[PDB]
UniProtKB/Swiss-Prot annotation, chain A:
NCBIfam families: menD. This is 2-succinyl-5-enolpyruvyl-6-hydroxy-3-cyclohexene-1-carboxylate synthase. Homodimer. Induction: By isopropyl-beta-D-thiogalactoside (IPTG).
Amino acid sequence: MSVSAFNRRWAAVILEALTRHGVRHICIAPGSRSTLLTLAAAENSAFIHHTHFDERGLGHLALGLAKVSKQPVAVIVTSGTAVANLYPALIEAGLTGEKLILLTADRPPELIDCGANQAIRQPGMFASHPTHSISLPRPTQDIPARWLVSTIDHALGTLHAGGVHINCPFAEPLYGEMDDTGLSWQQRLGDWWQDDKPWLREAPRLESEKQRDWFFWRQKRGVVVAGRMSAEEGKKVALWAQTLGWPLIGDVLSQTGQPLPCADLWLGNAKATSELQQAQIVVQLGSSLTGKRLLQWQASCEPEEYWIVDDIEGRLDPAHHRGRRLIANIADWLELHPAEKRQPWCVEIPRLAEQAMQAVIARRDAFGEAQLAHRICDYLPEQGQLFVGNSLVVRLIDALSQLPAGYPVYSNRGASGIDGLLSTAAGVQRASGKPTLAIVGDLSALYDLNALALLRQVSAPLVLIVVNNNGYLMPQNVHFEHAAAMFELKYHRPQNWQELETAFADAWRTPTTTVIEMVVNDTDGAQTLQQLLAQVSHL
Amino acid sequence: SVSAFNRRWAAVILEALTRHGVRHICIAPGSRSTLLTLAAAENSAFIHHTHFDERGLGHLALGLAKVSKQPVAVIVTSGTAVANLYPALIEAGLTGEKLILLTADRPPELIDCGANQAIRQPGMFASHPTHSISLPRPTQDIPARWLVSTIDHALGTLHAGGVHINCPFAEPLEMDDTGLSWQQRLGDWWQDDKPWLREAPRLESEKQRDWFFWRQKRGVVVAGRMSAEEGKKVALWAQTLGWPLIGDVLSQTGQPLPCADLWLGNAKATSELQQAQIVVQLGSSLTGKRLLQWQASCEPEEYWIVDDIEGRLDPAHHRGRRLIANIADWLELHPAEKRQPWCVEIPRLAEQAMQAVIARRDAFGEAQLAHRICDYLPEQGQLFVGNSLVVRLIDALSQLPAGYPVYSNRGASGIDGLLSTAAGVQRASGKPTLAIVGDLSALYDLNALALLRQVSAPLVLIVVNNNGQNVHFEHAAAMFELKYHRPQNWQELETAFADAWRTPTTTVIEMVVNDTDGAQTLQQLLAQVSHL
Ligand SMILES: O=C(O)CCC(=O)C(=O)O
Ligand SMILES: O=C(O)CCC(=O)C(=O)O
Ligand SMILES: [Cl-]
Ligand SMILES: [Cl-]
Ligand SMILES: [Mg+2]
Ligand SMILES: [Mg+2]
Ligand code: NA
Ligand code: NA
Ligand code: NA
Ligand code: NA
Ligand code: NA
Ligand code: NA
Ligand code: NA
Ligand code: NA
Ligand code: NA
Ligand code: NA
Ligand code: NA
Ligand code: NA
Ligand code: NA
Ligand code: NA
Ligand code: NA
Ligand code: NA
Ligand code: NA
Ligand code: NA
Ligand code: NA
Ligand code: NA
Ligand code: NA
Ligand code: NA
Ligand code: NA
Ligand code: NA
Ligand code: NA
Ligand code: NA
Ligand code: NA
Ligand code: NA
Ligand code: NA
Ligand code: NA
Ligand code: NA
Ligand code: NA
Ligand code: NA
Ligand code: NA
Ligand code: NA
Ligand code: NA
Ligand code: NA
């Protein structure tokens, strides 16, 4: 008899199944036609719950949680444009491999395309961006609970990386009658209910094989380029390159400690370019390289072979070198392709690197963007993590700073959207519980302004540094003092290093967010970068 | 010079669009869109609007299109910028605004190889735009007449909804003469005022040959969203036929049988309606709970929906007719003939309904604000309503004047872009504007207070706060240098307004209420009115 009693049990089966695939965190924007999913989510003790009222920011919240935990993270939303607001964070996940399980409630098929409310076409809404899309059928008991959990297990089990869109229509009414309808339908799953594992286990691994000619290649003149990877991988890559005797170019996202710092500067030197032309093979581990000089060099170098090792699939070399694209966990890969001690073949590079760091240091003082970027590793929280936006300021950290090996760095450098940086940082901080430094420009802060609601609720101190270069009535110069106030966050606008170091100490005390607004020019940082680059090009 | 030719290809795209009434252009600053952007700046045909949030940029453009009834272009750079446009594109696809999305793209060699800010853009919006064009990589080997014809075809044939034109450009982005002669192949089209190719079919239903029979039956007229002029014409027409007119808040009909959401819960009213043999619905997106239940359950011999949107609009799937037409043209094609009012109990029920509500107009609550709203309407202005309890309340408790413009985002009723849509609504027409929103809506689109800063006539944003949080908007107002008031009674409210109408600025009025009085008061009026 009861359609709502049945709808609840369909929904509970879908949630129970996610539970068998590592889904722990779940993000929900409340709204009264996803009711069944939200409701099955609350009954389910397995989930840690997060909410936000802006579905765009909710996607990014989920994206941040996945990015740090390396587990799949679910998102439930109600039917209509709620769903479309998930696209950005979905897109970013498809590039960087976050597993976002989007459960989008939908009207039933009889209510689509007929003037009904909050009703749009949701199946295939995200085109090729999900790794898998499941458009679930209208709930009925005539489809066995084993089909339903098997379809979900198929999608999650085969999922190497990226998001999955599960569209979930529900018959109206979403409320009412409250009986045993669909009770024996659930009971056919038997003791899968007290189990632990998927109903259907489908989990093939996608992995490249051991390169049998590694023992030759490892004795040639190689270079290691280290892109985005985990904190732990960065230290491993640092050891492996050092053992090989190969120059390591490490990105801000690599956490290698950057043994050859200020690459963005020293790749400008003709002495450095000439040593590198002698390179017979380049082994690039990780991807999304940050620096202009590194991107130019990569694009123009001509080693016999060019290798990209990364756990994401597809082509990762925008200059299309002849070589290899190797799919792997970077740490397993280094295991499979171990180093033997060999004397370094580079003689000039390690000098130029030192000299470049000395040049930046002769410049540490003017209270600006480039200098904050240079000194950033002085303000990093102890046992913390850094989240870094899509701004000049982070190319400047990459160019002018030397971050410590193994210190966690996170970002959104898939498509480098500037639309979700605060909600992302909020997910990054929640997943790990660590105190967090997030560095962002003013447009990114204005873009995701309402994620300040999210940042109120951090589990450790979070410092949001907003680098502000600004950025009918005369245009105004916006600031973030009232924004902070509006959300009961701490706020500082330091004028000098003493005030910044002070602002940082007060910030690192309680668990909430302190906004530190650093007003700067729209030219000093760029300008300082160029000066150091010419200086180094000459050295 | 690749660069010099890329500017000229972009040039041709933009000039094409001007021959189709595109006057407004909304732009979000971005490095990879520079060519469409520069081209746009150099073309005098356009009025330019900027926003930093692409989602709110889409909704601005939607607000512009909603009032202007002309196509509005949007330009964004490659990447998730593009995806931020989906919400407004989807809305347009339902209410019929013509948003022309020009999405800059990396050239095809740079897709799917880990390049920066590079994503799969063609087909990205799935079935939602009315037409989608994935333009080829620019080259002078494809002649300019192809490019303009492709555009003239997308826009000439556009009945309603959006158009996605993906525009890849090769890099670098050396002011040569490189594609000059390529452009000059268009000869004097460049000095012309029309499209290159004119393809402009009309989509429209034929005259209903049996109207003279049906216009004498016992009909009910239901009026949803339509233009202000049409609101007045439908009122005249319904009156002439002797048929009751259930006029939505979006109808601008003057609601001659006000408080339908109450009197529809009375058996004397429904029983009289049961005698209805035809329902003519003009427009759609009906607002009221009672009206939506009534609509779903009614059982005339035929149900008609007249609207210029295409596709089914009756979610009860009644037997009858779906008629595509400009409402105004349709009335002319199907004239009323003067005829005696077949209804007796309803006009009295409506009156006692209003009377019942006037009786409880004093408490300083959501419901009373809603009932008294026409005391605060700006003269010769326009109202913009959110998707919020407070606007159900206006529809239930108020009677808005015939022919006063009302606008809304009520296709998919997202709460995601109401401020930025409001800002486009004010700019399209230049009128002073009232916009009514809930706290959650205002939070959702908070950064669009930056658009509301820049208005050509006063705008008042009533934010109706029943906060579940416990946030306020004084600091948001202060962040963007907007005037702010939190009135605590009717005198403080009336005063906030007098101030508000003097200068071309936005003032934020925050009404703080309860999460229950509003629902309660409506529930008690329903019961009361159902007992008459
Ligand atoms: O990249 C930059 O120059 C800073 C841009 C920025 O202004 C922002 O994202 O707020
Ligand atoms: O504030 C209202 O009028 C009710 C709707 C609502 O809660 C909101 O959109 O914030
Ligand atoms: Cl993940
Ligand atoms: Cl081509
Ligand atoms: Mg900036
Ligand atoms: Mg509210
Ligand atoms: Na789990
Ligand atoms: Na929605
Ligand atoms: Na699939
Ligand atoms: Na489906
Ligand atoms: Na079963
Ligand atoms: Na599985
Ligand atoms: Na039962
Ligand atoms: Na292999
Ligand atoms: Na091999
Ligand atoms: Na690092
Ligand atoms: Na590090
Ligand atoms: Na040299
Ligand atoms: Na590759
Ligand atoms: Na391979
Ligand atoms: Na850099
Ligand atoms: Na940023
Ligand atoms: Na925002
Ligand atoms: Na946002
Ligand atoms: Na843009
Ligand atoms: Na409309
Ligand atoms: Na339009
Ligand atoms: Na598309
Ligand atoms: Na092509
Ligand atoms: Na070509
Ligand atoms: Na050719
Ligand atoms: Na033609
Ligand atoms: Na193109
Ligand atoms: Na044209
Ligand atoms: Na033709
Ligand atoms: Na009415
Ligand atoms: Na009426
Ligand atoms: Na209602
Ligand atoms: Na209803
Ligand atoms: Na119809
Ligand atoms: Na609202
Ligand atoms: Na409207
Ligand atoms: Na609407």
